[model samples]
Target: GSNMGGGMNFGAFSINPAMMAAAQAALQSSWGMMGMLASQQNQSG
Candidate 1:
């Protein structure tokens, strides 16, 4: 419930874009529009 980035998982955390992209680069990913929660797991948000 926190917007401070510490409360969410790796996918939900809003940190460095390059770092995030690096981790997500070779993986299958999807996005939740307008901050909507994703039902799928093991992916980038």
Candidate 2:
């Protein structure tokens, strides 16, 4: 879960830019997989 994590989880760290980037990449990959699955299902159906 990508929280603000001020004093809860991330400790004294402000924020990780790399973590946000990775989250974006992961979201994109997940959307791509969903699109691929839909295409395959449509073709099979």
Candidate 3:
């Protein structure tokens, strides 16, 4: 994770580092699932 102060601010909206971490985790989990599905398809094919 990148370390920075004051989080991220885009005009009136702002997002903190913690929220970014949660989103990253979700993405990685979904990516893992996709990988598993791909491997299964390869085995069947």
Candidate 4:
């Protein structure tokens, strides 16, 4: 499977240089998901 989807895997990219961009995209995707949740909670809270 992908080297980074099992979890945050932010530290996995250092071992696979070629997947650098993929890591960023994944990281951004992860962050964005949480961002949405936080935004909704903020509005309700």
Candidate 1, residues 1-45, lDDT tens digits: the string is 545343434464353334344544344444442354435446556
Off by over 4 Å in 2: 1-13, 19-45
lDDT of 4 by residue, 5-39 (tens): 43363442322224335332233223322233222
After superposing all C-alphas onto the true structure, candidate 2 shows an RMSD in angstroms of: 12.8
lDDT against the true structure, each candidate: 0.43, 0.31, 0.33, 0.32
The residue ranges of model 3 lying beyond 4 angstroms of the native Cα positions read: 1-11, 17-45
- Clash list (residue pairs), candidate 2: none
C-alpha lDDT of residue 12 in model 2: 40
Candidate structures ordered by lDDT, highest first: 1, 3, 4, 2
Q: Residue 3: error of model 3 in Å? A: 36
TM-score for each prediction? 0.15, 0.13, 0.16, 0.12
**Which is superior by lDDT, 2 or 4?**
4
Instruction: Output the worst ten-in-a-row residue range by lDDT, candidate 3.
Output: 32-41
List the candidate 4 regions with Cα displacement exceeding 4 Å.
1-6, 13-45
Specify the highest-lDDT model's number: 1
Residue 32 displacement (Å), model 2: 26
Comparing 1 with 3 on lDDT, the higher-scoring candidate is: 1
lDDT of 3 at 45: 25
